[PDB]
Amino acid sequence: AHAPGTDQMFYVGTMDGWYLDTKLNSVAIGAHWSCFIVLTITTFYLGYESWTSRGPSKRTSFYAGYQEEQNLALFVNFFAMLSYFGKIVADTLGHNFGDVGPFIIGFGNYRYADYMLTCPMLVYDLLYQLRAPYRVSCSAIIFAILMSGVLAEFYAEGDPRLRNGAYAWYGFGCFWFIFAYSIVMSIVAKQYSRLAQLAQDTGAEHSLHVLKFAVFTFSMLWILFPLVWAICPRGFGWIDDNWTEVAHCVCDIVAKSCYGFALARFRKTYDEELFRLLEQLGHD
Amino acid sequence: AHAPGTDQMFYVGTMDGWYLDTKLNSVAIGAHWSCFIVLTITTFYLGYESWTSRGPSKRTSFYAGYQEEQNLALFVNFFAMLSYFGKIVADTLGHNFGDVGPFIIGFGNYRYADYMLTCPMLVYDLLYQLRAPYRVSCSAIIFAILMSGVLAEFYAEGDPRLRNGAYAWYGFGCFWFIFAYSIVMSIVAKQYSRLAQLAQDTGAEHSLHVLKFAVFTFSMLWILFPLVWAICPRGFGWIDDNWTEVAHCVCDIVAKSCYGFALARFRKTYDEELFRLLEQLGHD
Amino acid sequence: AHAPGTDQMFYVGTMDGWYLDTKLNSVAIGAHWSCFIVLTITTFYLGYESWTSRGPSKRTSFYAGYQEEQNLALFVNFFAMLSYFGKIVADTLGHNFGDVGPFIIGFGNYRYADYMLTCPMLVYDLLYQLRAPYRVSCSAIIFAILMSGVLAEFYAEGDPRLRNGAYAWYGFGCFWFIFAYSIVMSIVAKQYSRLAQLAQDTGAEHSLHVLKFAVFTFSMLWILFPLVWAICPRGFGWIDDNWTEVAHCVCDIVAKSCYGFALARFRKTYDEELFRLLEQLGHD
Numbered sequence: 013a014h015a016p017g018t019d020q021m022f023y024v025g026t027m028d029g030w031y032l033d034t035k036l037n038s039v040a041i042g043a044h045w046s047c048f049i050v051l052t053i054t055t056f057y058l059g060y061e062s063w064t065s066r067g068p069s070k071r072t073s074f075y076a077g078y079q080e081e082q083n084l085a086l087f088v089n090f091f092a093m094l095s096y097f098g099k100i101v102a103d104t105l106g107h108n109f110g111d112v113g114p115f116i117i118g119f120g121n122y123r124y125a126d127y128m129l130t131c132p133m134l135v136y137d138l139l140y141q142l143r144a145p146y147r148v149s150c151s152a153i154i155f156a157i158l159m160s161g162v163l164a165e166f167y168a169e170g171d172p173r174l175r176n177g178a179y180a181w182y183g184f185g186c187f188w189f190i191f192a193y194s195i196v197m198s199i200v201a202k203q204y205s206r207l208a209q210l211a212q213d214t215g216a217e218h219s220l221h222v223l224k225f226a227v228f229t230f231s232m233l234w235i236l237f238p239l240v241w242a243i244c245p246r247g248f249g250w251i252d253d254n255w256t257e258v259a260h261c262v263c264d265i266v267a268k269s270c271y272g273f274a275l276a277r278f279r280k281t282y283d284e285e286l287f288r289l290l291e292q293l294g295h296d
Numbered sequence: 297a298h299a300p301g302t303d304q305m306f307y308v309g310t311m312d313g314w315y316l317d318t319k320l321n322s323v324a325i326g327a328h329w330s331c332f333i334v335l336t337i338t339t340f341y342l343g344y345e346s347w348t349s350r351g352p353s354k355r356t357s358f359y360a361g362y363q364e365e366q367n368l369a370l371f372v373n374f375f376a377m378l379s380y381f382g383k384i385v386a387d388t389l390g391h392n393f394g395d396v397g398p399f400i401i402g403f404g405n406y407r408y409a410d411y412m413l414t415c416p417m418l419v420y421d422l423l424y425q426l427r428a429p430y431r432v433s434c435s436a437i438i439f440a441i442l443m444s445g446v447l448a449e450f451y452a453e454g455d456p457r458l459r460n461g462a463y464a465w466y467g468f469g470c471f472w473f474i475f476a477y478s479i480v481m482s483i484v485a486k487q488y489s490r491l492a493q494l495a496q497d498t499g500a501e502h503s504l505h506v507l508k509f510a511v512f513t514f515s516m517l518w519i520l521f522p523l524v525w526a527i528c529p530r531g532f533g534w535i536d537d538n539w540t541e542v543a544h545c546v547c548d549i550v551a552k553s554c555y556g557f558a559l560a561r562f563r564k565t566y567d568e569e570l571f572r573l574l575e576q577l578g579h580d
Numbered sequence: 581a582h583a584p585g586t587d588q589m590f591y592v593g594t595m596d597g598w599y600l601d602t603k604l605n606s607v608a609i610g611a612h613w614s615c616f617i618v619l620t621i622t623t624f625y626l627g628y629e630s631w632t633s634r635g636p637s638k639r640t641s642f643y644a645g646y647q648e649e650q651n652l653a654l655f656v657n658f659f660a661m662l663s664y665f666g667k668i669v670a671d672t673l674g675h676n677f678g679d680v681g682p683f684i685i686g687f688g689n690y691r692y693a694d695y696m697l698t699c700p701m702l703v704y705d706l707l708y709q710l711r712a713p714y715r716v717s718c719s720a721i722i723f724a725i726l727m728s729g730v731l732a733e734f735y736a737e738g739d740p741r742l743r744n745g746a747y748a749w750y751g752f753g754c755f756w757f758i759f760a761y762s763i764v765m766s767i768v769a770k771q772y773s774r775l776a777q778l779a780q781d782t783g784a785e786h787s788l789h790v791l792k793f794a795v796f797t798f799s800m801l802w803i804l805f806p807l808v809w810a811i812c813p814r815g816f817g818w819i820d821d822n823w824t825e826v827a828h829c830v831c832d833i834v835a836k837s838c839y840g841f842a843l844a845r846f847r848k849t850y851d852e853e854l855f856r857l858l859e860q861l862g863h864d
């Protein structure tokens with residue numbers, strides 16, 4: 013695209029950049045391959061869990077087929093796998109894939125466009141395990157934060173005259189992220205405190221450790237993405253574009269595959285009394 | 297973009313127009329600033345209402361955290377605020393923002409693309425307060441009407457050879473809007489008649505006035521947008537592009553901030569018997 | 581759009597191709613007109629059914645207004661009608677409409693972008709009539725399959741250097757479609773077997789034939805779209821672009837209008853005992 017006063021052309025948001033050669037090296041391609049393999053393995057594992065999912069009473073046959081929120085995490089990983097498959101295809105074809113081509117929500121050709129579909133599901137899935145309030149609200153504010161990140165990505169890669177819009181959108185997203193982070197931390201802490209005080213001398217002591225570790229760790233590790241934005245060339249630039257892909261791949265692996273495996277480990281050890289305590293949680 | 301037979305270039309739907317200088321004057325920028333400030337204030341007020349929201353019985357602590365439909369209106373305003381923040385950013389950067397750049401649903405860089413996310417929520421939120429039937433259907437038809445408006449906006453700003461497509465899409469949207477308008481008016485009138493005949497000699501006479509005023513006024517004031525389309529340069533052209541932004545800002549302010557404040561005023565005066573009458577409404 | 585090493589320009593995903601003259605003949609325009617007329621007639625018929633919809637007991641007045649899943653099929657046809665109206669407009673204006681212009685989900689300017697909104701609703705609506713499990717999962721995997729088809733359409737129409745990406749995306753979609761097809765066939769067969777063994781000596785023998793024919797026929801006829809992709813120029817090329825539009829129009833007519841008419845025929849002959857058997861289906 014052309015801009016007034018400059019002879020340089022900008023390929024962000026155009027199909028002209030879609031036909032350009034790739035700018036990545038072997039490290040980024042290897043990171044994409046590793047992330048795709050991990051996501052595929054986790055997707056198959058969660059699908060096998062969903063197929064052979066007896067309930068907490070181990071009596072219902074297709075428990076996940078009727079209570080489909082249990083499949084929610086699986087959905088995330090599945091879509092994540094899709095968002096990486098195209099990257100692999102681009103890496104095999106050798107054409108440019110970063111912030112170029114059509115804008116589709118749920119596809120990873122833009123930096124935070126793929127996260128729009130999966131992150132609200134991640135937040136709702138995490139808040140459900142404690143029967144926490146304000147679940148759809150957190151999902152909506154996370155969707156807004158990701159949209160702000162996408163607009164910042166658009167502003168950063170275009171005309172240098174409009175570079176300051178990226179900082180404004182980043183500040184907007186960071187303000188609302190700090191708000192949502194504080195709300196989520198408070199709600200999760202309160203719900204876990206009530207669950208711990210409801211399960212005294214019950215026998216669910218072993219099954220509480222996995223749930224606590226999962227919810228606290230994978231709710232605290234959501235601050236890595238703003239830090240990656242800060243240290244990548246969008247911010248200070250302490251790392252280059254090739255190591256930003258590796259950081260993003262590691263972040264997705266930790267945030268999705270490990271979280272799904274932790275939920276799968278928790279689901280095979282809890283039973284009826286912990287389930288009824290969880291039901292009692294979301295009523296007072 | 298290039299068109300056959302003409303040397304002129306069209307910037308609608310391209311990133312070339314994103315880098316162009318802004319075409320607005322001080323009046324439109326002031327209108328955008330006023331709308332953004334009003335939406336931000338209303339969003340904070342509704343968020344404070346949602347945090348400190350005791351139920352109709354004034355016993356449940358996080359009532360809005362579990363019955364999250366009460367937060368629905370808040371969501372609208374929040375997203376509306378986002379749709380104006382970018383406008384402010386453009387006004388601060390001085391680049392063109394109208395019908396240019398990427399097409400994202402929920403962002404206001406296109407005329408009716410931001411309304412796609414929030415208007416169905418507005419319609420469902422308004423129909424819920426009377427426990428009215430046909431709620432998702434009205435939301436879907438409003439989404440279709442907004443999509444028709446977006447296509448008309450695409451056709452109007454492009455090649456003059458294709459100008460008549462805007463009129464066709466406007467006629468499609470107006471036909472379905474007249475249908476939906478009649479259906480909504482009939483349903484709301486019937487539901488309010490039943491509510492009025494259910495609350496004889498109950499004491500909810502004062503609390504009924506606010507609900508009646510809110511639902512009737514903010515369901516009747518939805519016809520302003522087609523009239524603005526008719527009088528703007530898309531239609532007869534009695535006003536210019538700079539005064540169309542002011543009209544749109546006033547329309548959003550009235551349709552969203554006043555409606556949210558009216559719901560907040562209604563929610564703090566109704567109590568258990570009006571709530572159980574509302575519950576009885578949506579059963580026969 | 582420009583590509584390195586070639587002087588040829590590619591109009592896929594650009595507004596430059598939106599202003600080009602149409603490439604269709606009278607056959608494709610007639611097919612579009614016929615499909616639009618059929619979809620409009622079916623939409624009006626289903627809307628009249630929804631308005632005058634007494635329940636299975638023939639006592640509830642606005643049964644479809646409160647149980648709105650019954651309107652789901654109607655929604656599909658309505659949106660399908662929208663996706664064809666624009667085509668008609670293009671055919672009346674004479675400008676190019678295939679894989680050009682803005683990318684909007686739910687609009688038919690791209691080959692499988694309109695199906696994204698309606699196909700998951702079709703799958704959920706079909707699985708609900710048997711109270712089958714795994715309804716949202718099938719809808720999500722169908723959405724992913726349609727996204728893969730859209731990416732294949734993008735790769736096929738662009739630079740010949742990137743032609744092999746279309747085959748990769750087609751293989752991805754076909755793999756997941758075979759998986760989903762097998763799952764849906766197994767679930768539907770099991771649910772219908774249980775329904776048949778629950779209705780012995782009941783009198784619902786006549787009302788079972790319509791439901792069986794509808795579900796089996798319109799779940800089996802979903803394999804036509806991959807075959808059309810195989811035989812069109814995207815694959816072997818046994819037919820041209822003008823006869824691909826006719827095949828797609830016939831496929832939409834059969835998959836949507838006939839299915840909606842079959843559901844309308846089934847709904848006016850079943851009564852309370854079949855409804856309670858259907859309720860008992862989705863519990864064990």
Ligand SMILES: CCCCCCCC/C=C/CCCCCCCC(=O)OC[C@H](COP(=O)(O)OCCN)OC(=O)CCCCCCC/C=C/CCCCCCCC
Binds near residue numbers: 078081129130151155
């Ligand atoms: C502006 C964006 C804001 C986004 C806010 C929301 C973010 C995403 C929220 C995800 C919501 C959860 C999706 C899945 C819900 C599934 C609920 C469910 O199946 O529970 C079971 C429940 C009841 O059980 P029965 O079937 O009766 O079984 C009884 C016999 N044992 O089943 C149902 O009734 C299902 C009815 C449909 C529920 C609504 C599903 C809507 C899904 C929308 C898409 C979800 C992802 C959206 C992502 C948004 C990205 C922009």
Ligand SMILES: CCCCCCCC/C=C/CCCCCCCC(=O)OC[C@H](COP(=O)(O)OCCN)OC(=O)CCCCCCC/C=C/CCCCCCCC
Binds near residue numbers: 363
């Ligand atoms: C093609 C587009 C058509 C659009 C049609 C729909 C337009 C938007 C409709 C908005 C639907 C309402 C969204 C919010 C629903 C929230 C429901 C809810 O929370 O009610 C509470 C309810 C039950 O209460 P419990 O949590 O058990 O508490 C018991 C202890 N007291 O909670 C739930 O079960 C929530 C389950 C998830 C509900 C589904 C939410 C899906 C939201 C989808 C996005 C909504 C906006 C979509 C905009 C569309 C723009 C294209």
Ligand SMILES: CCCCCCCC/C=C/CCCCCCCC(=O)OC[C@H](COP(=O)(O)OCCN)OC(=O)CCCCCCC/C=C/CCCCCCCC
Binds near residue numbers: 698716
């Ligand atoms: C990533 C994409 C994955 C897509 C996965 C989902 C695909 C689409 C699934 C469609 C879900 C069904 C949509 C319609 C649900 C309507 C449910 C309903 O109305 O049931 C009635 C039910 C209960 O009855 P009452 O009103 O109490 O009446 C009592 C007095 N008799 O009413 C409700 O509570 C409605 C609450 C809202 C339900 C949630 C609706 C959300 C709709 C989201 C959009 C649906 C299409 C999405 C298409 C996706 C394309 C990307």
Ligand SMILES: *C/C=C(C)/C=C/C=C(C)/C=C/C1=C(C)CCCC1(C)C
Binds near residue numbers: 161235
């Ligand atoms: C699987 C992916 C996950 C959990 C992604 C989470 C992403 C975020 C929390 C992103 C946050 C952002 C901001 C707070 C500011 C603006 C830019 C973002 C998108 C990096």
Ligand SMILES: *C/C=C(C)/C=C/C=C(C)/C=C/C1=C(C)CCCC1(C)C
Binds near residue numbers: 408441519521
């Ligand atoms: C907060 C915004 C609201 C309530 C917007 C409402 C908008 C409409 C009712 C728009 C209607 C249109 C038509 C009926 C015809 C075609 C164009 C539109 C988009 C102006």
Ligand SMILES: *C/C=C(C)/C=C/C=C(C)/C=C/C1=C(C)CCCC1(C)C
Binds near residue numbers: 695728729
């Ligand atoms: C009303 C429209 C319907 C029911 C459409 C159904 C479409 C499909 C089942 C499409 C499937 C595809 C594949 C399996 C592979 C890749 C390309 C598609 C989109 C043709």
